[PDB]
Amino acid sequence: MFKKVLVANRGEIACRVIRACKELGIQTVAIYNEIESTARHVKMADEAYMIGVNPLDTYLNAERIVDLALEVGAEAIHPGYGFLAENEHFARLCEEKGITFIGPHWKVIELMGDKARSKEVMKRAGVPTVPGSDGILKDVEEAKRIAKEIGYPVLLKASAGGGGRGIRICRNEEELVRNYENAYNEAVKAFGRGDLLLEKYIENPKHIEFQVLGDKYGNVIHLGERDCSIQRRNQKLVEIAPSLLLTPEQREYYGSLVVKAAKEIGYYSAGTMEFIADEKGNLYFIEMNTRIQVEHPVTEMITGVDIVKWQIRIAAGERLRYSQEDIRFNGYSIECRINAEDPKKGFAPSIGTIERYYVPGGFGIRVEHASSKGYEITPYYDSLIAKLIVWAPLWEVAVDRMRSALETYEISGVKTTIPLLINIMKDKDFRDGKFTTRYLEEHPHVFDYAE
Amino acid sequence: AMFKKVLVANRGEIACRVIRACKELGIQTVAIYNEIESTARHVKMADEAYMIGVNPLDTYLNAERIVDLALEVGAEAIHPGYGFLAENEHFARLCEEKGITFIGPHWKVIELMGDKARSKEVMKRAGVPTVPGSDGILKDVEEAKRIAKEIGYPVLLKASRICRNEEELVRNYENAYNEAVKAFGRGDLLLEKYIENPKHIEFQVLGDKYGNVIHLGERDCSIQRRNQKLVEIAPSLLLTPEQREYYGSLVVKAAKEIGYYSAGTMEFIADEKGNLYFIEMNTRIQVEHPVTEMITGVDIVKWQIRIAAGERLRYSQEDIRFNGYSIECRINAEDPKKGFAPSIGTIERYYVPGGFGIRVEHASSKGYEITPYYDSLIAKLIVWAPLWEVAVDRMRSALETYEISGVKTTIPLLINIMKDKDFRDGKFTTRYLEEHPHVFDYA
Numbered sequence: 014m015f016k017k018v019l020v021a022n023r024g025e026i027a028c029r030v031i032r033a034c035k036e037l038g039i040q041t042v043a044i045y046n047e048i049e050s051t052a053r054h055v056k057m058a059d060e061a062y063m064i065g066v067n068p069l070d071t072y073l074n075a076e077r078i079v080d081l082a083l084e085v086g087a088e089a090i091h092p093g094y095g096f097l098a099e100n101e102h103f104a105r106l107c108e109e110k111g112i113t114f115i116g117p118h119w120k121v122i123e124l125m126g127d128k129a130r131s132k133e134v135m136k137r138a139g140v141p142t143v144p145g146s147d148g149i150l151k152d153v154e155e156a157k158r159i160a161k162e163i164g165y166p167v168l169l170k171a172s173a174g175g176g177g178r179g180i181r182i183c184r185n186e187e188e189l190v191r192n193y194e195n196a197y198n199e200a201v202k203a204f205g206r207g208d209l210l211l212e213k214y215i216e217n218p219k220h221i222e223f224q225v226l227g228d229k230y231g232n233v234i235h236l237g238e239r240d241c242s243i244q245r246r247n248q249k250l251v252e253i254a255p256s257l258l259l260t261p262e263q264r265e266y267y268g269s270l271v272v273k274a275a276k277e278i279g280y281y282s283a284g285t286m287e288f289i290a291d292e293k294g295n296l297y298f299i300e301m302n303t304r305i306q307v308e309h310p311v312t313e314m315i316t317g318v319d320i321v322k323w324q325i326r327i328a329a330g331e332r333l334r335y336s337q338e339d340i341r342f343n344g345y346s347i348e349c350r351i352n353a354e355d356p357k358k359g360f361a362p363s364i365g366t367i368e369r370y371y372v373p374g375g376f377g378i379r380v381e382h383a384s385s386k387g388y389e390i391t392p393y394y395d396s397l398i399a400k401l402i403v404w405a406p407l408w409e410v411a412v413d414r415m416r417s418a419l420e421t422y423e424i425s426g427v428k429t430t431i432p433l434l435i436n437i438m439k440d441k442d443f444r445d446g447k448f449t450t451r452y453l454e455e456h457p458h459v460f461d462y463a464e
Numbered sequence: 465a466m467f468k469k470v471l472v473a474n475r476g477e478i479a480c481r482v483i484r485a486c487k488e489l490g491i492q493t494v495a496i497y498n499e500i501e502s503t504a505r506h507v508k509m510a511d512e513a514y515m516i517g518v519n520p521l522d523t524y525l526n527a528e529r530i531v532d533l534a535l536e537v538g539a540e541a542i543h544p545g546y547g548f549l550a551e552n553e554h555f556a557r558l559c560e561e562k563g564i565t566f567i568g569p570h571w572k573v574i575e576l577m578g579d580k581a582r583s584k585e586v587m588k589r590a591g592v593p594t595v596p597g598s599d600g601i602l603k604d605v606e607e608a609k610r611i612a613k614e615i616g617y618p619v620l621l622k623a624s625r626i627c628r629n630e631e632e633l634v635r636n637y638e639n640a641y642n643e644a645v646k647a648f649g650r651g652d653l654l655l656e657k658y659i660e661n662p663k664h665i666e667f668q669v670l671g672d673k674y675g676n677v678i679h680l681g682e683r684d685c686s687i688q689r690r691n692q693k694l695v696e697i698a699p700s701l702l703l704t705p706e707q708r709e710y711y712g713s714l715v716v717k718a719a720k721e722i723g724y725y726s727a728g729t730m731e732f733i734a735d736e737k738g739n740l741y742f743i744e745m746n747t748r749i750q751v752e753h754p755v756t757e758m759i760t761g762v763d764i765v766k767w768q769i770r771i772a773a774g775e776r777l778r779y780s781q782e783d784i785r786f787n788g789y790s791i792e793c794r795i796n797a798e799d800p801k802k803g804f805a806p807s808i809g810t811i812e813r814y815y816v817p818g819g820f821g822i823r824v825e826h827a828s829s830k831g832y833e834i835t836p837y838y839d840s841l842i843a844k845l846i847v848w849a850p851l852w853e854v855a856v857d858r859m860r861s862a863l864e865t866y867e868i869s870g871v872k873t874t875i876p877l878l879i880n881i882m883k884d885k886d887f888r889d890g891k892f893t894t895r896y897l898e899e900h901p902h903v904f905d906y907a
Binding site: 028032035036038057310313319370371372373375376378386414417418420421 | 484488489490813814819825829854865867
C-alpha cells in the first residue's frame with residue numbers, strides 16, 4: 014500500500030480522492046494555484062504545494078507535477094478527471110520516473126483517446142457500434158441493400174471534403190435515392206468526387222454508459238450502467254443508476270461485452286464505455302473514458318463498491334476482491350450537478366462568491382463538495398459547486414428524495430442549476446422515466462421559475 | 465388517511481429530520497420558533513412557520529398554545545421530536561382530546577413508562593431482567609441488611625455512593641437518609657446491585673397500531689459523560705446474533721403487553737458477559753436513531769409518520785437484517801477541556817464533510833448562534849461501513865475534515881477517541897472517558 018499519494022487535481026474530486034486515501038491510511042499531497050490558497054482540498058491534504066505560473070498551468074504542467082512528486086516522496090499520483098487524467102504522456106512520464114499513475118496503462122490511455130481507434134477495438138471485441146457502410150458505397154444499389162440491412166432511417170454523407178458538406182436523413186428507399194443523387198452531385202461540384210458513406214441514424218437517443226473496473230491481473234468486472242441523457246451540449250446535469258431502459262438480461266449482456274472488450278485491451282483501474290441507445294435497448298458504442306467518471310457515486314450507491322478506493326488499491330497491486338456474481342444492483346440513485354451557471358441564459362457561468370450555504374443531509378443523501386461560505390467561483394475552473402446524490406429502494410422515492418433535498422439546498426451569491434433541477438424532479442415525464450438527450454429542448458417549462 | 469399537514473413541535477436537527485421525512489412523503493409542514501431564531505434552518509425548510517412563545521422554552525413547552533395552533537392552521541398531526549413535550553403525557557392527551565393525531569405512542573403508555581416503578585413491573589411481567597435489589601423503598605437499615613445479604617456485594621444506596629460491606633452500609637445509610645431529607649424532603653432510599661465496568665446497550669422497537677411490533681437490534685452508547693452520550697454504535701460488538709434476537713424478542717414481548725406503537729427505546733446496562741438489566745424506556749424517537757437506520761435500511765421517523773396515519777408496518781422480524789457497522793458522533797458546542805461546559809458564540813467557518821458511507825444530521829450554516837437556552841448540539845456525524853475497523857477509519861477521516869470555528873466543539877476529542885487503540889478494539893465501558901484522559905490532550 015502506498016505511503017504517500019499526490020492528487021493532481023482540485024475541487025470536489027480532489028476531496029473525494031483525499032478522503033479515500035485518509036480512509037486507507039495514506040498520506041496525501043495537494044497541489045494548488047495561489048488564487049485558491051484557501052481551497053478545501055488544500056486544507057484536507059496532509060501536505061500542499063503551490064505550483065504553476067497561472068491557474069491552469071498548476072494542473073497541466075506534467076513535468077512540474079511528476080517532479081514535485083519525486084521531490085516530496087509520493088509513490089503515486091491520482092489525476093481525478095479532466096486536466097491530465099487522460100493524457101498518455103503524463104502517464105508515461107510517471108512510469109518512466111518510477112511513480113505509479115492511478116489509472117490504466119499509458120498505452121491504453123493513448124489507444125482509447127482516438128475515436129476511430131476505439132471504434133475498431135470495440136468492433137473486434139464484439140461491442141456493437143453504429144452500423145453503416147464499410148467505407149465508400151460502391152453505388153446506389155449497394156446503398157439500397159445496406160440501408161435495408163441496417164434499418165431505416167439512415168444518413169448519407171460525402172466522403173471527401175475533410176469534414177462534411179452536409180448529412181442527409183433518408184427514411185425510405187425513395188428518399189435514399191433522391192438524397193444519394195443530390196449528395197453525389199453536390200459533392201462532385203464541391204470536391205470533384207461524388208463517393209458517399211452511409212450510416213445508421215439513431216434518432217432521439219438516450220445516453221447510457223457502463224462502468225468497468227479491472228485489476229492488474231486480468232480480473233475485470235462491470236458495475237452496471239448509468240443513464241445520463243439529461244444533459245445540454247454534452248454537459249451532464251442529471252445522472253441515474255441503474256437505467257430504467259435496460260432489463261437485468263440486457264444489463265448483463267452488455268456488461269459482459271464491455272468486460273470482454275476491456276480484457277482484450279488489458280484495461281485496469283476504472284473506465285466508462287459511453288453508448289447511445291434507442292427506445293428498445295439497442296446500444297451503440299460512442300467513446301470510452303479512461304479515468305474515474307464524475308457521476309461514479311450513483312453506481313457506488315447501487316452496488317456498494319467504492320470505486321476510487323479500489324483504483325488506489327488496484328494501482329498498488331491488490332487483487333480485485335469481486336466476481337461478477339457478487340455485483341448486485343439494489344435500488345436507484347440520482348445525482349444532480351449543482352453548477353454556478355444560469356439555465357435561463359444558456360447556462361452562462363455565474364462567477365462570484367457564495368454567501369448563504371446550507372448542505373442537505375439525511376437518510377439516503379450523500380454530498381460531494383468542496384465549498385463553504387466565501388468560496389469564489391472564478392472563470393478559470395469548471396462551474397461545479399456540488400454533486401448531490403440520493404439513493405432509495407424505489408425509483409419514485411428516489412425522485413422525491415432528490416426533490417426534497419434540492420428544495421433544502423440553499424446557495425446564494427451566484428446563480429445555480431438548483432431551481433431547474435427541482436423542476437425536473439417535479440416533471441411528469443421525468444417521474445415516468447420518459448427522457449432522452451434532448452429532454453431539455455422538449456420540456457421548456459422546466460426553465461420557468463422565480464428569479 | 466395520510467396527513468396533508470404536520471406540525472413539528474421541536475427545533476434544530478430533529479425538526480429538520482422530521483421535515484425531510486414529511487417532504488419525501490408529500491406532506492405540508494408547519495414550524496414553530498422563538499423570536500431569537502428567526503433565521504433557524506427548520507423555519508426555512510418548512511412550508512409554514514409561526515413565531516410563538518413568551519420566552520425561548522415556552523415556544524416548545526406550552527402544550528395548549530401548540531395544539532391550538534395546529535387546529536388553527538389545519539394540521540392533522542404533531543410530531544414532537546425528542547425532548548421538550550415528546551414524553552409529556554398531558555401534551556399527547558391534549559392532542560387526542562382536540563382531534564389532533566400525536567405522532568408517538570398513546571398517552572397512557574407515555575404516562576406508564578415515564579414511571580420508574582410502573583416501568584419495572586412492566587418488565588417483571590414480560591420477563592425482561594431488571595437490576596437486582598430492593599423491591600421498593602427500604603423499610604429501614606435492618607431490611608437493607610437482609611436485602612444486601614440476599615443479592616450479593618457490591619451494592620448501592622440511592623434516593624427515591626457504593627456500599628461493599630456492612631460497615632460502609634450503616635455509615636453511608638445514616639448520612640444518606642439525612643442528606644436526602646435535606647434536599648428532596650423525603651429520606652426514602654433504595655438499594656441496588658452494583659454492576660462493575662458497565663456498558664450502555666439499547667434496543668429499538670417499532671410497532672404499528674395493529675399489534676405488530678418488531679425490534680431493530682441494539683446500539684452501544686457507552687462513550688458518555690454524566691449520561692450525555694457522545695459516541696453511539698450499532699450493532700454492539702458485545703452481543704452475538706443469538707443474544708440480539710433473545711433480548712430483541714423480550715423487548716418486543718414487553719411492548720406488545722403494553723400495547724406500544726410508534727418508535728421506542730429500551731435502555732439497559734450490561735455486564736462483562738453480555739447480561740442485560742433494564743433501566744428505562746424512552747417513548748419517543750431516539751437521538752441516535754440514524755445508526756440503526758444505517759444498518760437495517762429502515763426509515764424510523766418516516767415510519768412513525770406512516771404508523772400514526774394508520775398504515776400497517778410492512779415488515780416481519782425475519783426481514784430485519786443487520787448489515788455492517790454504523791457510528792454516530794455528537795458534535796456539540798461545548799468544551800471537553802473544561803468539563804464540557806457549553807461554548808456560546810457564533811459559528812464562523814463551517815465545512816460539512818460528505819462522501820461514501822457518510823451522513824450528516826444538522827441545522828447549521830455560517831452565522832448559527834449557540835445560545836444558552838437550547839442544547840449544545842451542532843451536528844450528528846454518522847458513518848457506515850461493512851466492517852467495524854473501516855467504520856472507525858471513515859469516522860476518523862470525516863471528523864478530521866469537519867471544520868467548525870467560532871466555538872469550541874467535541875471534534876478534537878472525538879478524533880482522539882477514533883484513533884485510540886482500546887476504542888478500535890471494542891474495549892470501552894461507560895467509564896471510558898475517566899479511564900483514557902489522553903483523549904482530552906489536544907490543541
